[PDB]
């Protein structure tokens with residue numbers, strides 16, 4: 001575990017930087033695929049994976065990776081905070097400033113975080129007892145990120161995307 | 171596109187935050203898998219996907235997504251800044267403070283960024299001309315992120331790992 005402050009600060013900025021690099025590469029892969037460049041898409045994705053590897057290394061160096069119930073608890077904390085603190089204020093600030101798109105995207109994320117926080121809480125309870133959770137499917141709306149376990153409604157209750165557009169993890 | 175300074179700033183923070191939440195969850199998905207919770211793993215990978223959606227929404231709203239040639243330029247600059255500015259400094263600081271883990275993870279990232287900078291620079295000359303790159307495989311070292319196209323070395327030059335440990339993207 002890194003213990004010095006400056007080095008801890010730097011590995012944190014690098015952790016942030018590797019996560020933005022991975023996310024940008026994923027967004028790029030998907031644009032490249034869309035524009036008729038599948039091999040560039042393939043390049044962006046594999047480099048994405050390199051960045052996940054660096055980010056993952058910085059994270060462990062920081063001693064921030066625990067066992068699943070502590071991981072779940074970190075996700076609970078992250079999500080609860082975006083729900084109570086970060087998004088409501090970013091959302092109110094976009095609206096205050098007239099930025100309709102920023103209203104849309106922060107509203108999209110806020111409604112999803114509320115769900116994510118509940119799910120991680122319910123999952124920790126089972127994790128806290130040596131047990132896996134029992135689920136078949138998870139649906140994610142690819143417009144807003146609304147998230148539903150096992151049964152999802154026929155349209156996204158956030159943006160109205162039909163259930164056929166949902167991404168399914170099973 | 172968001173224009174007002176404060177909402178812009180909040181959207182860059184949310185995009186970083188969305189990005190660091192996708193990443194933590196990818197990492198937690200592997201730990202969960204490693205500890206015998208495949209479904210918890212699955213719930214992490216699925217929520218990670220919703221965060222990719224949020225992050226992509228923020229990034230499109232900041233107007234940061236171009237055609238592939240510009241996305242590659244954003245890549246080249248990212249990597250170059252890391253090669254020339256960030257990782258050399260963070261790695262000297264960590265060596266100045268005796269933080270050997272941080273010296274390892276910053277070295278591992280730096281050596282991978284050199285390669286990434288070069289790859290994107292060559293993906294660009296091809297993309298500037300309306301053409302896909304012509305490649306069949308990319309190899310990534312799961313320990314240090316080292317990156318090789320079409321041909322793997324017999325072992326990894328950065329961390330020693332044998333070729334047979336490389337993740338292939340094809």
Ligand SMILES: [Fe+3]
Nearest residue numbers: 018051054279
């Ligand atoms: Fe990296």
Ligand SMILES: [Fe+3]
Nearest residue numbers: 079112113116
């Ligand atoms: Fe979330």
Ligand SMILES: [Fe+3]
Nearest residue numbers: 141144156159
């Ligand atoms: Fe939706």
Ligand SMILES: [Fe+3]
Nearest residue numbers: 109188221224
């Ligand atoms: Fe989110």
Ligand SMILES: [Fe+3]
Nearest residue numbers: 249282283286
């Ligand atoms: Fe890189």
Ligand SMILES: [Fe+3]
Nearest residue numbers: 311314326329
């Ligand atoms: Fe390696």
